[PDB]
């Protein structure tokens, strides 16, 4: 599955960071079966923390590390699964992953963004 994300995303501290993610799946997005997991790790060999998941409806896990700054910013039926991180902080630097399953499409998609926080 083709997943389009910026490999590196550079955002100023305090600004809003939209993490763009779209995916080219031919099959129509069935909200009763579509799956999205947006996870976050600190390094390629570090632990992933799921912070948002599409199961029936958008589930925001409200991880303490993000406070209430995570928002969904996509539209699954339009093949957009982007997220928004409001008022970015230096600790938000790291790796963010968009996992995508669009049954009955066989292949799972994976986008990986390296978010860097500028002064």
């Amino acid at each position: 599955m083709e997943v389009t994300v910026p490999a590196t995303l550079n955002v100023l501290n305090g600004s809003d960071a939209r993490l763009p993610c779209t995916f080219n799946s031919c099959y129509t997005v069935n909200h009763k079966q579509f799956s999205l997991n947006w996870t976050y790790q600190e390094c390629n060999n570090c632990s992933e923390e799921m912070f948002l998941q599409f199961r029936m409806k958008i589930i925001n896990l409200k991880l303490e590390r993000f406070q209430d700054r995570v928002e969904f910013s996509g539209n699954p039926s339009k093949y957009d699964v982007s997220v928004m991180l409001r008022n970015v902080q230096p600790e938000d630097e790291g790796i963010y992953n968009c996992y995508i399953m669009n049954p009955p499409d066989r292949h799972r998609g994976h986008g990986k963004i390296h978010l860097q926080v500028l002064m």
Binding site: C26, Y27, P104, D105, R106
Partner: protein
């Protein structure tokens, strides 16, 4: 100028420019033989060694003025350029420009680039290329750039007249390299289409091969000649699509929904909340195994639905939604699919299930008019185009050859030798040829004895037989090898073939090569062609093959290139989609059986489209890759591929069967040693007869004749024949009633019994009467009386065996089924059927010889198929799901039976039509050659691992090659030969009865001539001008072309307003379309009223005016009667049939195009013959229908035999037979008739309400039935095709200009009055020499006129005088020629003369001028 060779030099250029300045200060065509691209005429001899490949001054004087210079290569090739500096930088003299010239025209300059192109092609057919291909792409681009640079470095870009950008092929390679560089050095994205752009490199083959530019030019010309037929096709399709949209709008949305819903639900909520395939199956009745829901219907002759379900019009259409008459666009698609007869039986059955079965009358007319007739028109026009072009080309070639010949004439004015001669005397050709050919036929019959369940003894028998034949073959090989010089032996092609085969056989013998037995079988089988020396038709088929690969090899090459290109582009655009979107076209998320994901399968799909099957692949393609591109691709493939294929086909036909053009052989040196040996053995046997008969002789009444004449008088009387015809019709019609419902109507049953008795009595009396008057000798020496005799004897035997009581005694029950031959008694009565019947018998000898050749060729193929697939088709399916088992479990037959023992619903089931022996081989080959049922056989073939091993998916993937080679040498080449022999035979027949039509009765001939007269009458009176100033001024306004043009534009707009009506339209659109129709009707009525006021009563003269009035009346009455049907009565079906009247106005568009009118007139003029053939075909349909009902009415409803479309009633049987008259679906009907044993059938099944038991059919009679029927129908439709093609060839060529105006008739009389002042209408032959010299052109005849005046064959009346009309007719014949109107004009001028001068005594001719001069000399 043989010594006109001059290095292009600066002084020559200065002279050019000087002369050009001379020309411009004072202010013809090029010799096509010196034109570039051609070859230098030999009149210049060899080239000086320093002159070749060097700028030479222009030879043609036409260009000798303009700045030009040519170069000739070492192959005498002419190459023109321009002397102007290229981009004002390179003078022709410059060394760089010279070296580029040297490189450009060089024989390594084509081979280089051609090899590169071919490697590029072989690199395009790569699904996922490795990374070598990146460097290879770079190098390819480099070579192309290098070539383009060399070209624009010796021709200039566009500065002058011989420059790079001039040739369109240079445009092609230019845009190729432009796109290449763009893609490679900008790298934007969407590389799919960008890479598709790189298939145009393949087109560069057409520019690097010498004979591939002329071919495409010819194709373009043949296309250009198709304008009228394209127009008529679009128009007819659109009209029929309007009809179908009117009659069927929304019918295919009929599914049957469950009556009882739960929990307060309705149709709207449900259709809103459901989206699945299971959820749809819960509420709508779906037949097991079907993606689309069962089409119910509202009428009583429509498909019924199970209790608990009501017919409702809701949901999407079937086939993913791509089949419906809901909108004009989808109706047009469906009708285009109907025109090409692609899978049209499914649309047929789906429309007859939703709408009533009475709606078939629409399919009959559509099939006949559209498919048959339009396709015949296309074939006719393409054949005329090709014929004439070929004829012109050959004529031009002959003229050039003649010129060349004329110019040539102008130029002229130890022990080895001993046993060698021994064995060469021993080669003994008059007998060993027979020996070895009998050996060959024996070998062929011997290999045709394999089957699947053989025994070991048979195996070793076959082994020893093959060994013996191989030894004999090698022995004859080595004998002829040593007997003739080995070099001489090897010289002869046939001996090369034989040696090849024998050597391959021996290689098979020696080592362990048993693996590839395919090649062994194939090669020893091909040996049969050695019979072509003594068999003319086999030799003709070999010639048809030789022509297609060696005289028309360029056309075949173009076909291969086009197929390759289409395959490649199909892979690039659609290949990824099939992998990504697979679950949308398949339930197991695996690629379907036909895809475009790699080159081989893409090629197979292109081949399928070429064969004729394109609708199904296209639906899957639309699902995975969108409608637009899929449609475009498939339509381009269809049209272009079919064009090229028909061109190749017709080229083969004309070239090969031009026997008269290929008959130049001298006296046969050796009548084949078959004939020599035949004479020798005849002499020998006559000898032996003589000596053996010698040894045998040594060892040992006025009442009777009156009765005869009376019976004659009776049985020849018209009342009698009419009565017998009536009885025949009554008897035949009484056979249509013994359906399976005969028990419900018992009174009719008894009536029919006694009527059969009466009919038998009448026919016996008639037979006795015939014997009494005709006599025994005359009665039995006929083919009709024997038929009647047989029929009446069968009936009499049945009657006597029923009255006696010994009925139901074995064969007596079967003999009763022969009552379905009673309709055959009508053949002798209707002359219309009789003419075509006698025509068909005339063709039987010629077809029989070809049928034999076809059978031999098929045997060569069926034996191969038997050696490849003997019993490998058995699979261990699951009966409930009908699904083959995964083959990872259940690998072999033993495992399948071990499964049977534990499970319950599995079978080790063989295919029904397989290759288990040459019989089923012939059957499978027939199915393949008709493209019906071919796919099922192919899937198993390519899935076959071994004899008892379970089939695996695409294990033998390349077996498709087998079917491809078959379809090419069977179906394509055999059909070519067939058509050729048929047209030759029909030409010979038409010539035999003296150039007359063979499909029309004598009465129809006169009707045909009268209907021909209606074409181009030509005497025209004026329509009267009105006396009244007011009426007259408006009349002038009414008859202007502007009014007509406006009316045509309104008719076109009316059509457009009709096209926009869809299904589910809002009330607003309904109302506004209603009102627009109202306004159109008003304007049409108005136009008519206005003309009836201006034109007075002269309106009803032109037939088109009468048609206009009728269509106006029908339109207005349709409108008002619809408005009354709405608010008084209630009928949906009749309402739409009434509204069908408005399509009448659309037909007025024919009034405009003079091109379409000719085609429709040809169709009309070819109706009677079509009518007679249709009568014969309907009669055959009736007899088969009755047999079918009697024999199959109780077979299992399996596949193609539904609740509808069975043989249970006459109507159903007819619907089935009309369907398979086009051969569509016959495989489907035949399949359930092949069940003859459990568990495929039950022979003890009780039918409620009857006494018949078994539900399975006798396979032998079923086969015979279907195969014979399709063969006969094929013959009949070939006859129809020939009829239409002949009539079109005639009509297109009937007329000539006849530019003689009436003033040329007056000047003929004004000169006549100067020599005959008495108006005696008779002039002396002596005065003819001057009368022809006093006429003005074109009737002028200059002195010496007498040489021509004798050759015109004028008759001479008593006194050596000639009549006026004799002289007039001879002169108009000289200027016009022999056209079809010429015999018609002579007719009308004579009858106008006979009615004016009843004095016939003075018109008798005693001699003619040609006969008179012969008497003079």
């Amino acid at each position: 100028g043989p010594q006109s060779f001059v290095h292009f030099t600066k002084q020559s250029l200065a002279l050019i420019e000087q002369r050009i300045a001379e020309r411009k200060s004072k202010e013809p065509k090029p010799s096509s033989d010196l034109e570039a691209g051609k070859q230098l005429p030999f009149i210049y001899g060899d080239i000086p060694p320093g002159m070749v490949s060097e700028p030479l001054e222009d030879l043609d004087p036409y260009y000798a003025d303009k700045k030009t210079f040519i170069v000739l290569n070492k192959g005498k090739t002419i190459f023109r350029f321009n002397a102007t500096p290229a981009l004002y930088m390179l003078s022709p003299f410059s060394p760089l420009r010279r070296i580029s010239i040297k490189i450009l025209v060089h024989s390594l300059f084509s081979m280089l680039i051609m090899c590169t192109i071919l490697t590029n092609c072989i690199f395009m057919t790569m699904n996922n290329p490795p990374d070598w291909t990146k460097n290879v792409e770079y190098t390819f681009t480099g070579i192309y750039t290098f070539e383009s640079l060399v070209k624009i470095l010796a021709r200039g870009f566009c500065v002058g007249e011989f420059t790079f950008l001039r040739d369109p092929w240079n445009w092609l390679d230019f845009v190729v390299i432009v796109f290449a560089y763009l893609t490679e050095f900008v790298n934007l994205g969407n590389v799919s289409a960008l890479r598709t752009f790189r298939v145009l490199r393949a087109l560069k083959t057409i520019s690097v091969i010498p004979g591939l530019k002329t071919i495409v030019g010819a194709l373009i010309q043949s296309v250009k000649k198709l304008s009228d037929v394209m127009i008529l096709t679009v128009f007819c399709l659109s009209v029929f699509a309007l009809i179908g949209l009117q009659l069927f709008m929304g019918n295919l949305k009929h599914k049957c929904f469950r009556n009882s819903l739960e929990n307060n639900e309705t149709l709207e909520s449900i259709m809103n909340t459901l989206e699945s395939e299971e959820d749809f199956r819960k509420y709508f009745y779906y037949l097991e195994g079907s993606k689309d829901a069962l089409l119910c219907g509202f009428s009583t002759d429509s498909g019924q639905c199970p209790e608990g379900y009501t017919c409702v019009k809701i949901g999407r259409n079937p086939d993913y939604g791509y089949t419906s008459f809901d909108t004009f666009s989808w109706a047009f698609l469906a009708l285009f699919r109907l025109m090409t007869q692609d899978y049209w039986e499914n649309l047929y059955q789906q429309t007859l299930r939703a709408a009533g079965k009475t709606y078939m009358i629409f399919f009959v007319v559509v099939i006949f008019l559209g498919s048959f007739y339009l396709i015949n028109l296309i074939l006719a026009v393409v054949a005329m185009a090709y014929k004439e072009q070929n004829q012109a080309n050959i004529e031009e070639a002959k003229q050039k050859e003649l010129e060349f010949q004329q110019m040539l004439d102008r130029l002229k004015k130890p022990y080895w030798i001993k046993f060698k001669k021994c064995i060469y005397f021993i080669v003994m050709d008059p007998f060993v040829d027979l020996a070895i050919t009998i050996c060959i036929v024996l070998n062929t019959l011997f290999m045709a004895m394999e089957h699947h369940p053989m025994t070991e003894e048979f195996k070793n028998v076959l082994a020893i037989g093959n060994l013996v034949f191989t030894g004999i073959f090698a022995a004859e090989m080595v004998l002829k090898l040593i007997a003739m010089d080995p070099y001489e032996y090897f010289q002869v092609g046939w001996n090369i073939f034989d040696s090849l085969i024998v050597t391959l056989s021996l290689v098979e013998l020696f080592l362990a090569d048993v693996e590839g037995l395919s090649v062994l079988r194939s090669f020893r089988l091909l040996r049969v062609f050695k019979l072509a020396k003594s068999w003319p038709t086999l030799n003709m088929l070999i010639k048809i093959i030789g022509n297609s690969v060696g005289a028309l090899g360029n056309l075949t090459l173009v076909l291969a290139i086009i197929v390759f290109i289409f395959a490649v582009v199909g892979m690039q655009l659609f290949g990824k989609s099939y992998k990504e979107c697979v679950c949308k076209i398949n339930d197991d998320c695996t690629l379907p059986r036909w895809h475009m994901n790699d080159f081989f399968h893409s090629f197979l799909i292109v081949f399928r489209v070429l064969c004729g099957e394109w609708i199904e692949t296209m639906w899957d393609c639309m699902e995975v890759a969108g409608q637009a591109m899929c449609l475009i691709v498939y339509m381009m493939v269809m049209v272009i591929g079919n064009l090229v294929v028909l061109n190749l086909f017709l080229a083969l036909l004309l070239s090969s069967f031009s026997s008269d053009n290929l008959t130049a052989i001298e006296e046969d040196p050796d009548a084949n040693n078959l004939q020599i040996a035949v004479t020798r053995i005849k002499k020998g046997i006559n000898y032996v007869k003589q000596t053996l008969r010698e040894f045998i002789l040594k060892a040992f009444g006025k009442i009777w004749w009156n009765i005869r004449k009376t019976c004659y008088k009776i049985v020849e009387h018209s009342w009698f024949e009419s009565f017998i015809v009536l009885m025949i019709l009554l008897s035949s019609g009484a056979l249509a009633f013994e359906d399976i419902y005969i028990e419900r109507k018992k009174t009719i049953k008894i009536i029919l019994e006694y009527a059969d008795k009466i009919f038998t009595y009448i026919f016996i009396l008639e037979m006795l009467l015939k014997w009494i008057a005709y006599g025994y000798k005359t009665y039995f020496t006929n083919a009709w009386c024997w038929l009647d005799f047989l029929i009446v004897d069968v009936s009499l035997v049945t009657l006597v065996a029923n009255t006696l009581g010994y009925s139901d005694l074995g064969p007596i029950k079967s003999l009763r089924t022969l009552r379905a031959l009673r309709p055959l008694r009508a053949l002798s009565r209707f002359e219309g059927m009789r003419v075509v019947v006698n025509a068909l018998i005339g063709a039987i000898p010629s077809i029989m010889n070809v049928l034999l050749v076809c059978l031999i060729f098929w045997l060569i193929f069926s034996i191969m198929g038997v050696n490849l697939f003997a019993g490998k088709f058995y699979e261990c399916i699951n009966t409930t799901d009908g699904s083959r088992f995964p083959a990872s479990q259940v690998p072999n037959r033993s495992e399948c039976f071990a499964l049977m023992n534990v499970s319950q619903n599995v079978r080790w089931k063989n295919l029904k039509v397989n290759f288990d022996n040459v019989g089923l081989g012939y059957l499978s080959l027939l199915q393949v050659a008709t493209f019906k049922g071919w796919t099922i056989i192919m899937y198993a073939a390519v899935d076959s691992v071994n004899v008892d091993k379970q089939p695996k998916y695409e294990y033998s993937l390349y077996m498709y090659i087998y079917f491809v080679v078959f379809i090419i040498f069977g179906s394509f080449f055999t059909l070519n030969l067939f058509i050729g022999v048929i047209i030759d035979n029909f030409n010979q027949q038409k010539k035999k009865l003296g150039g007359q039509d063979i499909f029309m009765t004598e009465e129809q001939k006169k009707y045909y001539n009268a209907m021909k007269k209606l074409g181009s009458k030509k005497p025209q009176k004026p329509i009267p001008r009105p006396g009244n100033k007011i009426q007259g001024c408006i009349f002038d306004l009414v008859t202007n072309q502007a009014f007509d043009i406006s009316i045509m534009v309104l008719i076109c707009l009316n059509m457009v307003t009709m096209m926009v009506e869809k299904e589910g339209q809002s009330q607003h659109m309904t109302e506004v379309l209603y009102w627009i129709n109202v306004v159109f009707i008003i304007l049409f009525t108005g136009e008519c009223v206005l003309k009836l006021i201006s034109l007075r009563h002269y309106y009803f003269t032109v037939g088109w005016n009468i048609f206009d009035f009728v269509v106006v009346i029908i339109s207005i009455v349709g409108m008002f009667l619809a408005d009354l049907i709405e608010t008084y009565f209630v009928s949906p079906t009749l309402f739409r049939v009434i509204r069908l009247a408005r399509i009448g106005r659309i037909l007025r568009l024919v009034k405009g195009a003079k091109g379409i009118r000719t085609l429709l007139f040809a169709l009309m003029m070819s109706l009677p013959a079509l009518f007679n053939i249709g009568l014969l075909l309907f009669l055959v349909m009736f007899i088969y229908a009755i047999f079918g009902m009697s024999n199959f009415a109780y077979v299992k409803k399996e596949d193609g035999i539904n609740d509808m479309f069975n043989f249970e009633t006459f109507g159903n049987s007819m619907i089935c037979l009309f369907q398979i008259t086009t051969s569509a679906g016959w495989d489907g009907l035949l399949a359930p008739i092949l069940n003859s044993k459990p568990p495929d059938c039950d022979p003890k099944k009780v039918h409620p309400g009857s006494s018949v038991e078994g539900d399975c059919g006798n396979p032998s009679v079923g086969i015979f039935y279907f195969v014979s029927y399709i063969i006969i129908s094929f013959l009949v439709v070939v006859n129809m095709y020939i009829a239409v093609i002949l009539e079109n060839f005639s009509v297109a060529t009937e007329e000539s200009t006849e530019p003689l105006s009436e003033d040329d008739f007056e000047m003929f009389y004004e000169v006549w009055e100067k020599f005959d002042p008495d108006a005696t209408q008779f002039i002396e032959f002596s005065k003819l020499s001057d009368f022809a010299a006093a006429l003005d052109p074109p009737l002028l005849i200059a002195k010496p006129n007498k040489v021509q005046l004798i050759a015109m064959d004028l008759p001479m009346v008593s006194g050596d005088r000639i009549h006026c009309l004799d002289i007039l007719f001879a002169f108009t014949k000289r200027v016009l020629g022999e056209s079809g109107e010429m015999d018609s004009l002579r007719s009308q001028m004579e009858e106008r003369f006979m009615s004016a001068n009843p004095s016939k005594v003075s018109y008798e001719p005693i001699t003619t001028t040609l006969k008179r001069k012969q008497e003079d000399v």
